[model samples]
Target chain A: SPPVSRGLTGGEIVAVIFGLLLGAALLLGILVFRSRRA
Target chain B: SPPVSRGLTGGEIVAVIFGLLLGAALLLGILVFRSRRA
Candidate 1:
């Protein structure tokens, strides 16, 4: 076996992609509202 | 099939996870930014 140099597997990477994109999307979604209230 | 390299075996995976970290941070920032307005 190899060292744990790569913490995320291919599937984990895919999960992260979805998660990160969702995060970014959520981040962007909030941006849509701030200007009106602030 | 194009048997070059299968799955997320290299730099892209690394890059994607980076996006995940960044997305998490970005979302956090956005949450804080939006929270203050509410």
Candidate 2:
């Protein structure tokens, strides 16, 4: 509608969120790594 | 898969994006909210 965030329009927030999910995926991998180690 | 809005499409043109950030975990929720809001 209007606008939000720094030149982000809107999807920027969602994009960031997806990015976080991606990060979680990474952490998940780390867990797998640690589990494998242990 | 290709269904969008009452059938919207393409992430509904990034309708709205604004929320918290705690890595992918929180981001996933943001995605959910964004999608839902859309």
Candidate 3:
């Protein structure tokens, strides 16, 4: 069935999850630093 | 006054929300695929 319309693969999910984690961590780090400096 | 001792900034909150959305989407997509394949 065309693999269910070419939905996301496990690899893609992993990549996205890691990307989200990285983005969140970076944002939090920056905010924490700014708050400390303020 | 010291930015309320490191509370989240608006940008940080936005990033966290987006990160949560992405993570939830990826998780749900994987689960949906499994259910469909089964």
Candidate 4:
């Protein structure tokens, strides 16, 4: 049998997507705050 | 009996951190690009 690369599972993929969205939201929120402050 | 809500495991936490870092890198890259363009 050939070895395959260890990849994300469905649950982990969902978690990753959730994390990505959260990070984007946080970044955008910070940018907006800075823009408003400026 | 009290039910405990399920939470992220260690691997999922790592994945989330990876996702967050990746997202931050991507956002920073875009910001740098826009700053350069401006």
On DockQ, the candidate that comes out on top is: 4
lDDT of 4 at A22: 93
- Candidate 2's C-alpha runs over 4 A off are A1-6, A36-38, B1-21, B24-38
- Model 2 residue A4 CA deviation (Å) reads 1.6
Q: What residue pairs are clashing in model 3?
A: none
Per-residue lDDT of A1-38 in model 2, one digit per residue for the tens? 34555454443455556645556777667866986765
Which digits, one per residue and each the tens of the lDDT, describe model 4 over residues B4-38?
76555565577687888798789778877986765
Interface RMSD of each: 4.7, 6.5, 7.5, 1.4
Q: How well is each residue in B1-38 modelled by candidate 3, as lDDT tens digits?
A: 23523642443344445656676566556756987665
lDDT of each: 0.65, 0.53, 0.53, 0.72
User: Candidate 1: how close is chain B to the reference, as a TM-score?
Assistant: 0.55
lDDT of 4 by residue, A1-38 (tens): 12323644565677677888898889777977986765
For residues A1-38, write the lDDT of model 3, one tens digit per residue: 23466433333344345557775566556756987665
Instruction: Return the TM-score for each candidate structure.
Output: 0.40, 0.35, 0.38, 0.59
Query: In model 2, which residue pairs have backbone atoms overlapping below 3 Å?
Result: A20-B24, A21-B24, B4-B7, B4-B8, B5-B8
Pairwise TM-score winner, candidates 1 and 4: 4
Count residue pairs with overlapping backbones in model 4.
0
Q: What is candidate 2's local distance difference test score? A: 0.53
- Local lDDT at A9 for model 2: 47
Residues B1-38 of candidate 1: C-alpha lDDT, one tens digit per residue: 22337643455555566777788787677878986655
